[PDB]
Design an enzyme around this catalytic site. Structure first.
Site, short mmCIF file in Angstrom:
data_model
loop_
_atom_site.label_atom_id
_atom_site.label_comp_id
_atom_site.label_asym_id
_atom_site.label_seq_id
_atom_site.Cartn_x
_atom_site.Cartn_y
_atom_site.Cartn_z
N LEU A 73 9.69 61.15 2.97
CA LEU A 73 10.77 60.29 3.46
C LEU A 73 11.19 60.66 4.88
O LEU A 73 10.83 61.73 5.39
CB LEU A 73 11.98 60.38 2.53
CG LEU A 73 11.77 60.05 1.05
CD1 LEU A 73 13.07 60.19 0.28
CD2 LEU A 73 11.19 58.66 0.89
N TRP B 296 18.51 59.27 -0.56
CA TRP B 296 17.85 59.75 -1.77
C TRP B 296 18.69 60.79 -2.49
O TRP B 296 18.94 60.66 -3.68
CB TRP B 296 16.47 60.33 -1.43
CG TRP B 296 15.67 60.72 -2.64
CD1 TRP B 296 14.94 59.89 -3.44
CD2 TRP B 296 15.53 62.04 -3.18
NE1 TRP B 296 14.35 60.62 -4.45
CE2 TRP B 296 14.69 61.94 -4.31
CE3 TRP B 296 16.02 63.29 -2.82
CZ2 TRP B 296 14.34 63.04 -5.08
CZ3 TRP B 296 15.67 64.39 -3.58
CH2 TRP B 296 14.84 64.26 -4.70
N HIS C 287 4.35 60.99 -0.24
CA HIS C 287 5.32 60.10 0.39
C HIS C 287 6.50 60.88 0.96
O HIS C 287 7.50 61.09 0.28
CB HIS C 287 5.82 59.05 -0.61
CG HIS C 287 6.81 58.09 -0.04
ND1 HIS C 287 6.59 57.40 1.13
CD2 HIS C 287 8.03 57.70 -0.49
CE1 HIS C 287 7.63 56.63 1.38
NE2 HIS C 287 8.52 56.78 0.42
N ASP D 35 20.55 78.18 6.59
CA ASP D 35 21.43 77.03 6.77
C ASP D 35 22.05 77.08 8.17
O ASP D 35 22.55 78.11 8.59
CB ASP D 35 22.53 77.02 5.70
CG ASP D 35 23.17 75.66 5.54
OD1 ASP D 35 22.54 74.77 4.93
OD2 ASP D 35 24.32 75.49 6.01
N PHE E 37 21.89 70.78 1.74
CA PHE E 37 21.63 70.43 3.12
C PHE E 37 20.36 69.60 3.23
O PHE E 37 19.25 70.13 3.12
CB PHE E 37 21.53 71.69 3.98
CG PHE E 37 21.15 71.44 5.41
CD1 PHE E 37 22.10 71.10 6.34
CD2 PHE E 37 19.83 71.56 5.82
CE1 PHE E 37 21.75 70.88 7.66
CE2 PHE E 37 19.48 71.33 7.13
CZ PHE E 37 20.44 70.99 8.05
C1 COA Z 1 11.37 63.35 -0.80
C2 COA Z 1 10.47 63.70 -1.98
C3 COA Z 1 10.91 65.03 -2.60
C4 COA Z 1 10.56 62.58 -3.04
O1 COA Z 1 9.27 61.99 -3.16
P1 COA Z 1 9.14 60.45 -3.57
O2 COA Z 1 7.69 60.01 -3.45
O3 COA Z 1 10.00 59.61 -2.65
O4 COA Z 1 9.62 60.25 -5.08
P2 COA Z 1 10.91 59.39 -5.50
O5 COA Z 1 11.08 59.47 -7.00
O6 COA Z 1 12.14 59.97 -4.83
O7 COA Z 1 10.71 57.86 -5.03
C5 COA Z 1 11.76 57.23 -4.26
C6 COA Z 1 11.29 55.81 -3.82
O8 COA Z 1 10.10 55.91 -3.00
C7 COA Z 1 9.09 55.01 -3.50
N1 COA Z 1 7.76 55.66 -3.40
C8 COA Z 1 7.34 56.70 -4.12
N2 COA Z 1 6.09 57.03 -3.76
C9 COA Z 1 5.68 56.18 -2.77
C10 COA Z 1 4.50 56.00 -1.99
N3 COA Z 1 3.37 56.86 -2.17
N4 COA Z 1 4.46 55.01 -1.07
C11 COA Z 1 5.51 54.20 -0.89
N5 COA Z 1 6.63 54.33 -1.59
C12 COA Z 1 6.75 55.30 -2.54
C13 COA Z 1 9.43 54.74 -4.99
O9 COA Z 1 9.10 53.39 -5.35
C14 COA Z 1 10.96 54.95 -5.05
O10 COA Z 1 11.64 53.66 -4.98
P3 COA Z 1 13.23 53.61 -4.87
O11 COA Z 1 13.63 53.47 -3.42
O12 COA Z 1 13.75 52.42 -5.64
O13 COA Z 1 13.84 54.87 -5.45
C15 COA Z 1 9.00 63.77 -1.50
O14 COA Z 1 8.71 62.60 -0.80
C16 COA Z 1 8.72 64.97 -0.61
O15 COA Z 1 8.28 66.00 -1.11
N6 COA Z 1 8.93 64.88 0.82
C17 COA Z 1 8.66 66.01 1.70
C18 COA Z 1 9.63 67.18 1.43
C19 COA Z 1 11.08 67.02 1.92
O16 COA Z 1 11.34 66.18 2.77
N7 COA Z 1 12.12 67.85 1.38
C20 COA Z 1 13.48 67.68 1.85
C21 COA Z 1 14.45 68.51 1.01
S1 COA Z 1 16.09 68.32 1.67
#
Ligand code: COA
Lengths: 81, 154, 93, 360
Positions: free
Chosen positions: D153, D161, D151, D240, D132
């Site tokens: 999302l 992702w 970062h 959930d 989910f």
């Molecule tokens: C979502 C999460 C787990 C992944 O973190 P992440 O930094 O995106 O790491 P990733 O390996 O997935 O990177 C994905 C993309 O983001 C970009 N990226 C990574 N860090 C970045 C930063 N500090 N600034 C800008 N872009 C960044 C990367 O270049 C990568 O490029 P791509 O689109 O070609 O894949 C993390 O961001 C997080 O902990 N978020 C909060 C928790 C959450 O939302 N959990 C939900 C569970 S359902």
């Protein structure tokens, strides 16, 4: 003057809803407006649902009626995609 | 299922001065050719206290509509001071970009606007009379509040 | 100091959350609104449930927008004007 | 060995300390509701948690968690369910010298899930991978949101992702009309066309006759008996929205097993598109992966630690109620939790070191 049930929505509930919304701090004189907005939205949705139910010629508003009522409220998001 | 749907809105002149004209680079998508045209409004809310201080700055029409991805420029005149409170003019307000097909509103985007003085000295000691030639607007393009409605097309 | 309250820190979120508003007050509210609309109809319990879901979702989103509006005013405490601005931002309800 | 599986994915020259805490498969409540006049299927649950950390290279003792993911595994006489309960980061991966700027966490998730799938793939048994996707600030690491380098999302980004995470695992099998596999995505509030935009790019170049990604729900796959009431057709995972709404609907029960407000599954999802969690101004994802094939533990690395249910809960809860506001706080919490895990497993140290080999 009659009583209003919108003043029955307690302040702690509003504060918790604000907290869930990401709010850190709130002003003491904000609950009235919150209740106003809540009441306005719920009003609109109820108008739509009740109207849809009436035109359907049924005596009870089902949850689906509420769904079709909410479909008129539109979808709110961030960005475009 | 919408025939027309936005894909992006990039603000060109930002942070532009307050009296500077609004210019939006708008990129949307169309699935199939439509009979009517697309109407675009841009409403500035001068005061949040009431929906009366709303000013439809400019309304444009786009027709016909090609199939696929389309980009265009949207220009609108600056708001009028004679319809805005001299107090709530400086600070934070809102603007609405409305897209409607055949008069029927189906897209509603929302943006925040922050009017700021170009110098900190003016922010510390604001004059009773608003200095429009020293006020620059700063709008966010980060997170637009997009609301999509479902309407009948042709 | 009009009664400003600092909200408890959210240490960690969860994917499913119970509705915060109490059911009976929301129900009597819905009944009042139904009466004020001049109708002899009433809602199913599931219908009122959905109503509460929608209301609370709307309020949470509106509070997000409110917080964002309060941020761009360089403040941590949200106000009434922020709520109105958030409303207009959504496109007025 | 999980360390070896993860090492084959990570870039070359990437040193990472991992810890894998699990629990022995024990009897639990059935994932699916029992049909009227029958008994629930016997279900065995099995908890899993991966904690990935690095070193800011002050010394060797300097260690800070960069990623964490909790996954539940269900087992019945017909179905193996791998449910991703939670996943979160701290954002201190930035502290890693010469960051390769790769989708690292995505690769870690992919590797862990692949390992679990392979090591829990039973002969001739349908295997499902459900999750989910909801984009919120912090799930496992409190105060980590106050780390600027984190970062986080958004909704769309997170859904895309997770889809990109699962996509390779999906494509490791044959298309379904020789083990087959198909993916199912449901985004409340979006039509099929708008949902398609969340699919990986590869989905654009698949067989129109035999697709890989589908915007729907695996009804006739998860349930061999479509005549059962709708309540018996939806899994009830912990924490959930599906579960919560299922309970709220079950409140309408005294027709055997039939609801009142919801007559079918379509109505169920139509209602689901307007729940408090799925319509708070942010998009939400429902992801499933159906696989149809025509010391007793697989993971042997020192990172693995099998604790009792009680001790597992103790360790995890000890970890998720820490502070990660600053670097020092994160490191301190990492050390404390590591020591607590070492204590619960009756060892002097728990966790292993992994170095990536792949460089393509
Ligand atoms: C979502 C999460 C787990 C992944 O973190 P992440 O930094 O995106 O790491 P990733 O390996 O997935 O990177 C994905 C993309 O983001 C970009 N990226 C990574 N860090 C970045 C930063 N500090 N600034 C800008 N872009 C960044 C990367 O270049 C990568 O490029 P791509 O689109 O070609 O894949 C993390 O961001 C997080 O902990 N978020 C909060 C928790 C959450 O939302 N959990 C939900 C569970 S359902």
């Amino acid at each position: 003057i009659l009583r209003d049930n919108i003043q029955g929505i307690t302040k702690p509930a509003i504060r918790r809803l604000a907290r869930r919304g990401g709010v850190k701090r709130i002003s003491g004189l904000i609950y009235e407006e919150v209740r106003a907005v809540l009441k306005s939205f719920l009003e609109s949705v109820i108008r739509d649902s009740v109207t849809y139910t009436e035109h359907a010629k049924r005596k009870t508003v089902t949850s689906l009626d509420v769904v079709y009522a909410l479909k008129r409220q539109g979808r709110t998001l961030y960005g475009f995609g | 299922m919408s025939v027309v749907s936005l894909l992006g809105v990039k603000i060109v002149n930002n942070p532009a001065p307050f009296l500077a004209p609004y210019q939006f680079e708008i990129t949307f998508e169309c699935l199939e050719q439509l009979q009517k045209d697309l109407e675009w409004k841009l409403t500035y809310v001068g005061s949040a206290t009431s929906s009366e201080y709303d000013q439809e700055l400019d309304s444009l029409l786009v027709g016909p509509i090609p199939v696929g991805v389309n980009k265009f420029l949207f220009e609108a005149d600056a708001p009028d001071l004679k319809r805005i409170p001299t107090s709530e003019i400086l600070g934070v307000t809102v603007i609405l970009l409305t897209c409607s097909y055949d008069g029927r509103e189906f897209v509603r985007v929302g943006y925040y606007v922050n009017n700021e003085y170009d110098s900190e000295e003016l922010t510390q000691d604001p004059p009773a009379k608003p200095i429009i030639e020293r006020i620059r607007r700063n709008i966010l393009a980060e997170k637009p509040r997009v609301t999509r409605f479902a309407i009948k097309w042709d | 100091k009009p009664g400003t309250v600092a909200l408890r820190e959210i240490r960690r979120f969860q994917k499913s959350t119970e509705l915060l508003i109490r059911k009976l007050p929301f129900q009597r509210l819905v009944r009042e609104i139904a009466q004020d609309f001049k109708t002899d109809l009433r809602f199913q319990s599931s219908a009122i449930g959905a109503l509460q879901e929608s209301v609370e979702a709307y309020l949470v989103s509106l509070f997000e927008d409110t917080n964002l509006a309060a941020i761009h005013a360089k403040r941590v405490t949200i106000q009434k004007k922020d709520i109105k601005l958030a409303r207009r931002l959504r496109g007025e309800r | 060995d999980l360390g070896d599986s993860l090492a084959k994915v990570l870039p070359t020259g990437v040193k990472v300390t991992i810890r894998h805490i699990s629990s022995a498969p024990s009897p639990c409540v059935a994932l699916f509701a029992a049909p009227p006049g029958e008994e629930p299927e016997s279900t065995f649950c099995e908890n899993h948690f991966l904690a990935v950390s690095i070193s800011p290279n002050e010394n060797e003792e300097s260690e800070v968690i960069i990623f964490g993911i909790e996954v539940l595994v269900y087992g019945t006489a017909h179905l193996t369910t791998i449910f991703v309960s939670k996943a979160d980061s701290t954002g201190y991966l930035h502290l890693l010298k010469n960051a390769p700027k790769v989708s690292l966490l995505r690769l870690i998730s992919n590797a862990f899930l692949s390992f679990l799938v392979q090591t829990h793939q039973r002969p001739g048994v349908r295997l499902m991978v459900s999750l989910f996707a909801r984009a919120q600030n912090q799930y496992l690491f409190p105060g980590s949101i106050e780390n600027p380098e984190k970062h986080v999302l958004d909704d769309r980004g997170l859904i895309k992702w997770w889809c990109r995470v699962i996509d390779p695992i999906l494509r490791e099998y044959e298309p379904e009309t020789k083990s087959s596999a198909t993916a199912f995505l449901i985004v409340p509030g979006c039509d099929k066309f708008e949902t398609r935009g969340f699919f990986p790019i590869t989905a654009r170049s698949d067989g129109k006759d035999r697709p890989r990604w589908l915007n729907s729900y695996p009804l006739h796959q998860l349930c061999d008996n479509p005549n059962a009431p709708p309540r018996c057709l939806v899994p009830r995972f912990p924490d959930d929205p599906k579960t919560r709404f299922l309970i709220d609907l079950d409140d309408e029960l005294p027709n055997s097993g039939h609801w009142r407000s919801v007559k079918s599954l379509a109505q169920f999802w139509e209602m689901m598109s307007f729940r408090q969690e799925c319509s708070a101004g942010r998009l939400v994802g429902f992801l499933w992966l159906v696989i149809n094939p025509p010391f007793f533990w697989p993971d042997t690395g020192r990172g693995h630690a099998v604790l009792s249910e009680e001790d597992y809960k103790a360790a995890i809860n000890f970890l998720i109620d820490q502070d990660f506001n600053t670097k020092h706080k994160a490191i301190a919490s990492t050390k404390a939790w590591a020591e607590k895990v070492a204590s619960l497993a009756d060892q002097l140290w728990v966790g292993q070191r992994v170095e990536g080999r792949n460089a393509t």
